[PDB]
């Protein structure tokens, strides 16, 4: 383990577990969250709520004094954050969201407004729109390509194009699709709820090529100049073709990321295969399958992966680095795959500590410093340790469950 965990609760120093400056915008976050870097060198954070009805923004480097903005949505998005995009166009956060009813919502949030004091917003910061009939063919994945262009992926397997003409209106530019004709075979139906080989991951290469990963782990490659299927690789027929079970991916997730012209793909074989080839001209060319090192049955799920330039690790022999984030319940696992050379055959897995020192010390009773004694002493201890957001959320959960402090010295309470 070459890395350690440093936990940061951006409100820890302050008594109020919420910023005084919070603004609620309304249109006529504990399920997804991410950061995005902007023109001004500042990081903006965003959260999409459990229901996918609330979007929240706040500045990484000024969470307490800066403004957090809650944007309320009329209904949930069709398929969670997977039907949502956020990109900085020109001094604005452009946010598009296909909603459940079929609407295509546009949000325009000026950069200024995100770092201003204002609790008001002027002008058309949102546009509703119905470009296609999503009642019949339900979409599930929205992918940004450009300020005017971005594609839609459908549950049945089809791609839709979406071209912006003026500043607001969008129109379907359909792609040629003859994949459906496998319906002719006795092994597939159009009407079947199975059989769909929908896209589960997608990346844009050199502005023009659109690399898609399907539920059956096919890598298809679309040329946006042609709007034509250029490539179709079966990722699985390379390694040991197990007739027993290849788990066709049953949800959209982060199963590939590219750096320059390299491309790693996550294939499920005991949840353990990182294929990585190279792109070049368009041609994808295999190099090696790198398994994972995971035990206790292998019950970790990919959260996010990011292929990137090498780090400063204890091994100078490095060419590329894949950062990998697994999850199993609320427990997480961070690993770095180091590839040594341009052959993807020599590599090394680097693990990290997945609990902070403070937490480990508390769990393992290795804390010698924290003052002992009084019940209220323990109160100060825990309050100071955890921060107000958590401490008050915990005191909220207590009273709901009818657990109430008997007296000053209720040790049975503190235990809880």
């Amino acid at each position: 383990a070459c890395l350690s965990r440093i936990d940061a609760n951006l409100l820890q120093y302050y008594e109020k577990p919420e910023p005084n400056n919070t603004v609620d915008l309304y249109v006529s976050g504990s399920e997804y969250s991410n950061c995005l870097l902007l023109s001004n060198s500042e990081y903006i954070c965003y959260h999409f709520s459990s229901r996918s009805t609330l979007l929240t923004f706040y500045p990484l480097s000024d969470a307490y004094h800066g403004k957090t903005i809650n944007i309320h949505l009329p209904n949930a998005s069709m398929n969670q954050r997977y039907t949502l995009t956020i990109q900085e166009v020109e001094q604005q956060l452009l946010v598009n969201v296909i909603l459940k009813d079929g609407s295509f919502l546009t949000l325009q949030l000026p950069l200024s407004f995100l770092f201003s004091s204002a609790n008001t917003l002027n002008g058309e910061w949102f546009h509703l729109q119905n470009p296609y009939d999503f009642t019949v063919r339900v979409p599930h994945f929205l992918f940004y390509v450009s300020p005017q262009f971005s594609v839609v992926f459908l549950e049945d397997g089809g791609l839709l194009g979406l071209k912006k003409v003026d500043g607001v209106h969008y129109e379907p530019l359909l792609f040629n699709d003859n994949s459906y004709l496998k319906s002719l075979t006795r092994f597939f139906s159009r009407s079947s709820k199975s059989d769909y080989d929908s896209v589960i991951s997608c990346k844009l290469f050199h502005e023009r090529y659109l690399i898609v990963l399907t539920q059956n782990c096919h890598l298809k490659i679309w040329d946006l100049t042609s709007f034509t299927l250029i490539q179709d690789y079966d990722m699985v027929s390379q390694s040991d073709s197990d007739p027993s079970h290849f788990r066709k991916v049953e949800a959209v997730g982060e199963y590939l990321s590219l750096y320059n012209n390299t491309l790693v793909t996550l294939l499920p074989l005991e949840n353990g295969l990182f294929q990585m080839g190279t792109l070049l001209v368009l041609t994808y060319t295999f190099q090696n399958n790198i398994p994972t090192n995971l035990s206790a049955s292998a019950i970790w799920s990919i959260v996010d992966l990011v292929l990137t330039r090498p780090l400063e690790l204890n091994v100078e022999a490095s060419y590329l680095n894949l950062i990998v984030l697994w999850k199993s319940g609320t427990a997480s696992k961070l690993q770095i795959l180091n590839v040594n050379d341009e052959s993807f055959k020599n590599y090394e897995w680097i693990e990290s500590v997945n609990k902070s020192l403070v937490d480990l010390q508390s769990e393992h009773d290795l804390d010698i410093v924290t003052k002992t004694g009084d019940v209220e002493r323990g109160f100060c201890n825990l309050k100071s340790r955890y921060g107000t957001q958590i401490f008050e959320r915990a005191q909220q959960i207590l009273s709901e469950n009818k657990i109430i402090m008997a007296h000053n010295e209720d040790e049975e309470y503190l235990a809880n």
Partner: protein
């Protein structure tokens, strides 16, 4: 229960029986804001409910507060005249030994300033050490404070010998080992527990912090309240946290790998545990703020016994040597209460 009032302007800080010396075990001292008061406990006819009453004998004036108090084995009675030796701590942050004939202080030794503790003194204890010939060779006082120091103060035939020892944290209690004055125990605020041979590194250090059973989390701050030896050979060690968590270790046979037993008082114990002089497995602990006292049995015979509940805060308490009576100083009084079961 029988209740005996302290003088109207007397605020008690500490209460201790003279169990350390059989000649004087019916003597009770109360340290207060102007000195140390001595009472005598006698078997009246009474009803044999509480067949024990308290008679106030006298008051030793010192002119300043007394926070901790310990009789020595040197105490004696004569006809009548009481010859007393008391170790205590005063408002000037000094540690003192006062030798009296009744209320009159005939002799006084004071250890303070820079030569003394350099912060607040948290605890004191005293034992008499005799030579091979068996004259009084030394009287030894041990004390611990917030200056991260343990002080051993020996008063010998050729005069005083002073020694200081550094601590990793403030000293919160200290007590010589029963039947073996060569050994003693020192408690640090941080949970460290030292066994020490002062005649001589120091022999052993246990710690209650990492041992907390955590079936019920004892909390973030579980500052060590008290550690005391138990048994008449000092065969055991008992430690109690402010949180009420307690632990017991024995010292004999074979090899050892954990504390022998562990538990938790119903309430916090600001003053710590007061082990029974006759029943090792038993000790008392107070919820000093609401004025309740729980009685705990180490081998779980107890099942939450709370023989004492006052409607008032408890300042201090201690067992009479007989093991059935309890003396308790509250903010304005001292009670003698007899638990019928221990008779």
């Amino acid at each position: 229960s029988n209740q005996y009032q302290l003088p109207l302007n007397v605020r008690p800080y500490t209460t201790t029986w003279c169990s350390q010396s059989p000649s004087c075990s019916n003597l009770l001292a109360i340290g207060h804001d102007t000195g140390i008061t001595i009472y005598c406990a006698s078997e009246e006819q009474t009803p044999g409910s509480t067949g024990l009453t308290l008679q106030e004998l006298f008051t030793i004036q010192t002119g300043l507060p007394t926070l901790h108090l310990s009789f020595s084995s040197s105490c004696s009675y004569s006809e009548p005249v009481y010859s007393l030796f008391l170790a205590c701590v005063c408002q000037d942050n000094t540690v003192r030994l006062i030798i009296t004939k009744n209320e009159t202080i005939i002799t006084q030794h004071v250890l303070g300033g820079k030569s003394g503790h350099h912060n607040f003194v948290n605890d004191i204890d005293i034992a008499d050490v005799y030579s091979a010939d068996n004259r009084l060779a030394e009287q030894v006082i041990a004390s611990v404070g917030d200056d991260c120091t343990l002080i051993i103060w020996r008063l010998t035939d050729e005069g005083p010998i002073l020694a200081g020892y550094p601590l990793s944290s403030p000293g919160i209690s200290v007590q010589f080992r029963p039947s073996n004055p060569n050994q003693l125990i020192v408690g640090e605020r941080n949970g460290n527990i030292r066994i020490f041979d002062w005649t001589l590194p120091w022999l052993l250090t246990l710690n209650t912090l990492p041992l907390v059973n955590t079936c019920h989390s004892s909390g973030i701050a579980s500052s060590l309240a008290n550690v005391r030896w138990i048994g008449s050979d000092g065969s055991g060690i008992l430690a109690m946290c402010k949180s009420g968590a307690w632990l017991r270790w024995n010292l004999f046979g074979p090899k050892n790998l954990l504390p022998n037993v562990q538990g938790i008082s119903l309430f916090p114990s600001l003053l710590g545990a007061c082990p029974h002089p006759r029943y090792m497995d038993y000790f008392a602990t107070a919820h000093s703020q609401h004025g309740l006292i729980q009685l705990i049995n180490t081998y779980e015979k107890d099942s939450n016994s709370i023989p004492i509940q006052l409607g008032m805060p408890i300042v201090d308490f201690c067992w009479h040597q007989d093991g059935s009576h309890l003396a308790i100083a509250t903010e304005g009084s001292v009670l003698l209460t007899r638990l019928m079961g221990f008779t």
